[PDB]
Amino acid sequence: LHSKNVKGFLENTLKPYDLHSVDFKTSSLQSSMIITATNGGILSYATSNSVNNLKMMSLLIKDKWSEDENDTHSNSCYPVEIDSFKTKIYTYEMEDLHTCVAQIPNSDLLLLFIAEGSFPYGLLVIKIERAMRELTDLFG
Amino acid sequence: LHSKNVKGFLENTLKPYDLHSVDFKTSSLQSSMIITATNGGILSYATSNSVNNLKMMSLLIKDKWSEDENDTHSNSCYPVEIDSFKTKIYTYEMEDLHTCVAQIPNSDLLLLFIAEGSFPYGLLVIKIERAMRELTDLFG
Amino acid sequence: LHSKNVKGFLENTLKPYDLHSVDFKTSSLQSSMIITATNGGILSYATSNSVNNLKMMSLLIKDKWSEDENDTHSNSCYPVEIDSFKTKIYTYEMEDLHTCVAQIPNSDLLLLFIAEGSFPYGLLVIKIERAMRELTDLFG
Amino acid sequence: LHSKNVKGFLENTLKPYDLHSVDFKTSSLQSSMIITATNGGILSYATSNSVNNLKMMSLLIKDKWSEDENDTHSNSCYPVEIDSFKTKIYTYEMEDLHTCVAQIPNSDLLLLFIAEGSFPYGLLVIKIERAMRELTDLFG
Structure with a gap:
């Protein structure tokens, strides 16, 4: 009861699930x-x-x-350069959702993603990045 | 502008990040x-x-x-048998936390885990399962 | 160059991505x-x-x-009881795949899942567990 | 046996674990x-x-x-601009590991991460990005 073991056991139990x-x-x-x-x-x-x-x-x-x-940004801004032009990517939670806005050099429009608050912002910024590239690729 | 492509593009964009x-x-x-x-x-x-x-x-x-x-359970109960004895595992959210209760045949006590609501119940039930086995193993 | 900062920086950089x-x-x-x-x-x-x-x-x-x-099992076996009968669940990698076998009390058959080696065994054992319950539920 | 149900069951079973x-x-x-x-x-x-x-x-x-x-890059290159200067980020598997190289405008050095092949490249590119910013922030 509470033995060194029974304590150090429950502790070894706090460990994450890998x-x-x-x-x-x-x-x-x-x-x-x-x-x-x-x-x-x-x-x-x-x-x-x-x-x-x-x-x-x-x-x-x-x-x-x-x-x-x-x-105004320094933390949540993610500047990039696509097809020799520049654009900024921004994240922003609006009503518990994760969103992304970046501009297109060619048409001055904004590309935009909206997702649950369960969608990892990191993957989101990355996702929109390739989106811009692939986008401007099909329009030059 | 809105070209078959620009539409089917944004759609191909809805896709998950793998x-x-x-x-x-x-x-x-x-x-x-x-x-x-x-x-x-x-x-x-x-x-x-x-x-x-x-x-x-x-x-x-x-x-x-x-x-x-x-x-009373049929959905959230996870019956198991350890070291030839039986026990039931239960999950339960209490104040936005995931918890687990299962009984020990040997001492009639309850083993218990408490975690964030960000800890996957599945891994939790599994985690407590091995915990019981490993527990009763060290006490026979 | 190599300043306490530049070193302790790269170290603070080893950290996981949460x-x-x-x-x-x-x-x-x-x-x-x-x-x-x-x-x-x-x-x-x-x-x-x-x-x-x-x-x-x-x-x-x-x-x-x-x-x-x-x-013969003690580590990879996951005994359970469904609809007052007992069954054992087993995992096993065969040619880089994760699989699961458990028996049905009612018909003596084996239920079986096969998946990539990228499918978490934990979720797999859990997945087959509910499968058995739901299975035997529709047949009594 | 094989009833519409027993088939459509195993199929409903192929589903992912969410x-x-x-x-x-x-x-x-x-x-x-x-x-x-x-x-x-x-x-x-x-x-x-x-x-x-x-x-x-x-x-x-x-x-x-x-x-x-x-x-030479178009797919695996991730151009960015930090503190008004530009740098390119590259990923590359070397002996089953994920790595990242980006240059520092200030000292012409290369920043570098090496990780398992189990570390998501996406999070990696993102991780190194902030690293550069935070890096150049402490040196101007």
């Missing part, structure tokens, strides 16, 4: 949108399940965007 | 306790960071325990 | 089979993408099964 | 090094467990580096 060489998929996004950097004119978009609610965000986010590309 | 052969550790538990099935007399315990708060749970959980081993 | 409250799906199984415990007569099965190769396993695994339920 | 709002840590790096872009003169470094083997890589990687910053 998963080795596991394959994991994050969930998929909810929205993938393109809005004019200008007023947030939703050009195109895609979902998983109204269009009202979406627009609410296309504008809301864009707001939060120019509010950081001007009013 | 992690391949990744190594992941869950967090470690907060508490690993043994309480008399009887009144919840905390026999031994271990933590990661008062003893008051703990007891609150040792009793609270035990309550929720006998309240299911009698008042 | 994902907080993430949603992750494992991959889905490859095969979900039922074989007569007897000779491994594949009764039913399901896949994701020949039937030859499958049978190779239905028998191969079953072999490894009775070779453990008799020839 | 982890909801889980907290996961990747493993921690093995090496965090700074080498002169020049010849790979290991300036500073840190580990987790000879110094020989390390150097083998400091040079090996640097080789693979300039071999891509010149000989």
Whole structure:
């Protein structure tokens, strides 16, 4: 009872559960949108399940965007250069969701992802990065 | 603008982010306790960071325990047999935490884990299972 | 150059990358089979993408099964009780794949899962457990 | 036996195991090094467990580096801009390990991470990115 063992046991029990060489998929996004950097004119978009609610965000986010590309960033900004042009990537939680805004040099539009608060921001910034590259690749 | 491509692009973008052969550790538990099935007399315990708060749970959980081993389970119960004796494992969220209670045949006590609501119940039930085996192994 | 800082920096850099409250799906199984415990007569099965190769396993695994339920287990065995009857769950890597065999009390058959070596055994044992319950539930 | 149910059952069983709002840590790096872009003169470094083997890589990687910053990249390159200067981030598996090389504008050195092949490249590129920022922040 409480023996050195029974104590050091419960402690050895606090240890994490290690998963080795596991394959994991994050969930998929909810929205993938393109809005004019200008007023947030939703050009195109895609979902998983109204269009009202979406627009609410296309504008809301864009707001939060120019509010950081001007009013200000050092921590949550992720600057990159694609096809010899530059763009900034921003994350932002809006109503418990993770979102991403980055600009396109070619058309001055904003690319945008919206996802659960269960979608890892890191993978999100990375995901949007390749998205821009692949995007500008198909348009030069 | 909105070209078959620009639409089917944003859609191909909704896709998950796949992690391949990744190594992941869950967090470690907060508490690993043994309480008399009887009144919840905390026999031994271990933590990661008062003893008051703990007891609150040792009793609270035990309550929720006998309240299911009698008042009733089919979904959240995970019956097992260790060292030729039987025990039931139960999960239960109490104040946004994941917990586990299973009984020891040898001493009639309850083994108990408490963790964040970020600790996968599956790994938790599995974790406590081996815990019982390893436990009863050192005491026969 | 090498300043206390530049060293203690690279060290503070060794740290893990923490994902907080993430949603992750494992991959889905490859095969979900039922074989007569007897000779491994594949009764039913399901896949994701020949039937030859499958049978190779239905028998191969079953072999490894009775070779453990008799020839012998303490670490990789996960005994459980479903609908008042008992069954044992076993894991086993065969050609870099994770598999699971457990028996059905009602028909003496073996339930079986086969998956990548990227599918967490823990979740697998847990997955097959509920499978048995849900299985025997629909047949009494 | 094989009933619509017993088949559609095994199929409903192929489904992934969903982890909801889980907290996961990747493993921690093995090496965090700074080498002169020049010849790979290991300036500073840190580990987790000879110094020989390390150097083998400091040079090996640097080789693979300039071999891509010149000989050539579009997929595995991740250009960024830190503190108004530009740098490129590269990933590269060398002997089943994931590594990262990016250059420092201020000293022309290469920052470098080495990790298991179980460490998600995505998180790695992201991890090194902040590393550069935080690095150049402490030196201006």
